[PDB]
Amino acid sequence: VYRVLQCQEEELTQMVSTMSDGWKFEQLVSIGSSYNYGNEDQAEFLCVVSKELHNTPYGTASEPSEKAKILQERGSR
Amino acid sequence: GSVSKWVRLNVGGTYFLTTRQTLCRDPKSFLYRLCQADPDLDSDKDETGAYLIDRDPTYFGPVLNYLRHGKLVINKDLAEEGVLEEAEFYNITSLIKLVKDKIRERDSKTSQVPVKHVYRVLQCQEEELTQMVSTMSDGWKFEQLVSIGSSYNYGNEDQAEFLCVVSKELHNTPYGTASEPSEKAKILQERGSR
Amino acid sequence: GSVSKWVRLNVGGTYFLTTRQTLCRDPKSFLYRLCQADPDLDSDKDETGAYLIDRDPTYFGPVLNYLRHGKLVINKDLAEEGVLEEAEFYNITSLIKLVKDKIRERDSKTSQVPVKHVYRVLQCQEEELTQMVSTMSDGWKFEQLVSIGSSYNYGNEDQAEFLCVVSKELHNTPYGTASEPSEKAKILQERGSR
Amino acid sequence: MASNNTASIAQARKLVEQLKMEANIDRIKVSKAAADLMAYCEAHAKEDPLLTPVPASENPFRE
Amino acid sequence: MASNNTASIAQARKLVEQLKMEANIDRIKVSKAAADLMAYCEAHAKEDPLLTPVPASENPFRE
Amino acid sequence: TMDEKYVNSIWDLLKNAIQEIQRKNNSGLSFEELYRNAYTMVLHKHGEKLYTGLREVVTEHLINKVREDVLNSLNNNFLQTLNQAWNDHQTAMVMIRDILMYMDRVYVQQNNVENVYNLGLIIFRDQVVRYGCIRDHLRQTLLDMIARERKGEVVDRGAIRNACQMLM
Amino acid sequence: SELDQLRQEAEQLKNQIRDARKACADATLSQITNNIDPVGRIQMRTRRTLRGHLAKIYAMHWGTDSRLLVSASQDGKLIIWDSYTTNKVHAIPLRSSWVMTCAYAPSGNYVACGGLDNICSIYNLKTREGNVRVSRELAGHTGYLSCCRFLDDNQIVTSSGDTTCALWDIETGQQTTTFTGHTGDVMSLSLAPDTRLFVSGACDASAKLWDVREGMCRQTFTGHESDINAICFFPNGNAFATGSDDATCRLFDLRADQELMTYSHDNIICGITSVSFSKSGRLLLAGYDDFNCNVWDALKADRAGVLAGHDNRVSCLGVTDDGMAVATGSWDSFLKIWN
Amino acid sequence: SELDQLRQEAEQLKNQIRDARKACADATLSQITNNIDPVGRIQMRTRRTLRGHLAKIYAMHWGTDSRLLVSASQDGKLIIWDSYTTNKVHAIPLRSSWVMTCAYAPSGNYVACGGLDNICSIYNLKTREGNVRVSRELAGHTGYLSCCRFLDDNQIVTSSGDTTCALWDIETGQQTTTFTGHTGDVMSLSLAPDTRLFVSGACDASAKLWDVREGMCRQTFTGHESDINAICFFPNGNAFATGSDDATCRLFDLRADQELMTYSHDNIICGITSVSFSKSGRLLLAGYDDFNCNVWDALKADRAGVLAGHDNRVSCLGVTDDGMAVATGSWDSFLKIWN
User: Fold this and answer.
1) Contact G304, D28 (CB under 8 A)
2) What CATH number corresponds to the domain at position D44?
3) How many domains does chain D fold into?
4) Taking phi first (over 0 means left), then psi (-120 to 50 degrees means alpha), and beta for anything else, what does residue B176 get?
5) Which of E21, G196, H180, H213 has a C-alpha 20 to 30 A away from that of D15?
6) Into which CATH architecture does domain G1-339 fall?
7) F33 and C21 in contact by Cβ < 8 A?
């Protein structure tokens, strides 16, 4: 499973150091921003992180409710 | 001899004591020809009478395992190819089919020693990046996100701000067999080439 | 050898009761001469009336398997090298060549364990990029993609815009070599260095 | 059967059978089908937005 | 005899053999062969775009 | 080394062995050796050549057998000789089929040709029931028995059944 | 043997079909009824350019709600677009390479992608977690699958190579309803809005309408002599436009069992690579494989309009389920929306 | 012992050959006819600066449609350039390091590459999947490959080290017919367009023209005193141009069995490393260790022009196989298409 932690350059040390247990860092990239060449604005980096899970098909024990489907399709569009 | 409650098949010169009904599993097997009585054999031990059959005894282990116990589980020190080749000799189509399935399963689950992998690139704008990264397919491994610059809207929030690049430990080349080339596939391939 | 078509050998103390036909598959075989009478042959055991081949039967198995049914499968616990060395003692050239190919295939897959990886660099513009990423040579791996800014065809869409490193593991599949004494190769190496 | 040039008879048999009900099925005049198509098209011309200049507000493609 | 520079008889024999048929191959004089070549080249001069510059819409390197 | 040389050597031995086996005997070579040989040839793909040989083999066998018993059938007791010889030909075809299933299951189907057992029956059909004089003599013998049956006396019903069975 | 008698019987039956068609072949009122005003000059504007592909876009297919289209680009990637905001809802990495067909489920919860791998991949758009997981790897196709459309959420046909179109039970994963009888690699596959008859276009240039329950060729339309590329049913299910390598698009009709109308230009040599009908079906959008597409009047065969602006061939067309915009999956790696 | 005969016979045989060759020697009318059909000045411009390579390009081989240009660099990469668009149809990484030869099959389905591995890699340029899977890594070379050429897409002749230029069956990987007789390494290899003779240039400065079916050397042409760089067979299958480290290129004619003409200029002492015939064969494009190449009028023995615009040696030349323009694969990591 993969996640994209958006992090500003100042904050960067926190989430890297406070990296969760069982998770593994996989990639870090820079990114521009609206102010002053990209840094110091509120954001400079995306840290892609990954965890690993025992393989078992999803939805073989749970069937989504109707409100869940409504919310998912609201979020998608 | 031709019929006995138990028969000592000298496979590789080694005795396998097997009972008739297990050999009676499939009519087109060699073992069926041994069970039935129509003398065309002269090959056996010249001091006991046990039928000497010039075949490997080692892989007859798994062959007889499948024969007498229904399902096949091979010994993980015997290469499955020998099991298939020895099954060819005793002509059991079901076990051959299942061994081919097992070979394909083994190669799919493990063919990364010759590092067989599939790679794809998936350009994504910075905004929906977290969505398709998080919801990225099960079984595929993310490999590298690469920024792509632009001169659009002060260089940021362009429709192409990133190139995700993912991989897959599976491969579409044969696990033992796959989709084989054909003339019309080549026609469509060169049509798409131009 | 003029009696007992199912001729009994004492290979490594093991009584191999094998037909003349299998051994006579490849007359280039030491044993093919034992299928027939010859006066120099005076190697025998008088405790079982079976002739002596003072070679181990542990690797004689796969050799006899190949020679009987034109193909061998070595166990995943038995040395391919031992089968090979037992192979030349009977002088079957094709079997030895095939086992050499198998041995070098295995050793290529274990030269991976030493830190030995072949690296290559390809260059790509943004459009064509994924096309090589997708249809890249099977058995390699993607390792790195770096965007290098351009002023010739500024930025994006320049051929020199993207550099894609790829790699596989060092192999010696048909064979490996450390030097070629041919002089002209050395001359060309010196020329192409600078 | 394989002695009649290796089972080539079955395909022709199937062709004859499949031509039977194709001969049987109802036949309609070309003019009738044409007029039906015009009727449906003209009845739905208004509700086909391609045929009508789409105002700047109603579509999610000028939204 | 393989102690005669490791059986040089075979290599010398094939050298002589190869030297044999060179004479039996046709000998057609230089002037006539050159005439043949110029006839071919001048006849094909109009179909060599290097000697016959061609429009931009019929060559793939300006199209 | 010449693989094909070894192949045509063992295939010559197989030609003689198959001729003996179809001619019938139980003193002959072991079925296991012939089975092993045939399966290895089909797997290694010499069998295609073997097929061109084996089909040819079938033809010559009929020619070297069928014509002969035809001469015996016309001389005396036509149906009885035809029945015993058909029994021998059937057992020969069955055991040559049993020697090698590998060719029938894949190669015969891949060629889009029919079973070698079916092909042997077809050659027998050409030799016996499509050949003019043998067909006429079979029809005349059947006509004699069915006419005598029409008269009312009991006839050799089993022979008539055998003939009708070979017809289907 | 019996080949000659059955050949003669098939010949006379086919001649009977021909005679029935020509006898019931009246003058097509369409070109005659040009007193009805033409469609005039209507030209759509590219409201959205879905530039999110690098590889060439082969198949595009609007969703059941006509907001979430699915496109397949040849490298092997599926992009479910949101056409109202130009944001990718998903971007699926496919094991398949050379994908030519992507189909959206009736529920809008599955996507069927087909490549040369001979595997119809059925990807779940939404799993219980929320990622995109493959529902089923439908394997067992003799050749490559060229096109496919869902009959159900456990039923789908696959117009594949080697003359087959078998309906597959997705739940079990084995082919269920065979549809053999074609003589070419069945490339096209068009479902009528009734979904009880599907017309398949192959390289034999014969459009075979198959009944999807019994499974025999209900009708056998002919009149093309070049491989049929795309087939688009009329919004009613009574007629369909058929394209091929010829520049002639043939509007066939089921009632008359024969072509009603032609859309051909002797000034265009490009093969009709995609056919689509608008909401009313009055417009026949002629996708041309040069770099751009046209649109005819499906009742007059005159120039309704031309949608150009792609620098490489439009390989597939799609129309919204309200017909309110047309997307052009082209080979310039763009999906352009024309309102 | 008996060698005393064999040498003297050989000694007189060559003598006879000389007597024959000097008998066959007449005035070359080409240099005499330098008034007929003057080529004048030739000025060409590079229109494709294919710069995908980043290391010295060693060999090319234009496709049999003059569109797919396979060019190898010694780093271990092949580029199948799309010469009409300056795009890379394939960038192929090679396990072998320091490749020097790339042979393009007559079908555009296989490619051949030989490096300092003694291995002739044969790559299937297209499979069912689309990825470039290696077909066969031909083993059996006793020396390093220098050049290879396809005869069929399953038969291939190579030029290898240690006096070996054998002909291989691709399927088995076995050299069917081992040709022997050279006294040195075999660098060059040119095929006749008759597909019946291959001329091997070895380090002994002698071009041995060989039959292709069985072991038999058709001729032993010798005009050079230096090892042969490249050989270009005439499009008539009757003569070939030959370059070497000497500033002299030489034209050897089969019918005359001797050097028809010489090509040397005091202006250029650099060895002609690459030779190539025009579509007509009138012109001869010569690449040079000098940092630009030139063109002779091959039937005037004069410099028809100069192609300049490089800064490192042009180690290989390629000409479209209908004749349109010239690719100049230099060691500057660029390929230039002079049209």
Assistant:
1) no
2) 4.10.260.10
3) 1
4) left
5) G196
6) 7 Propeller (2.130)
7) yes
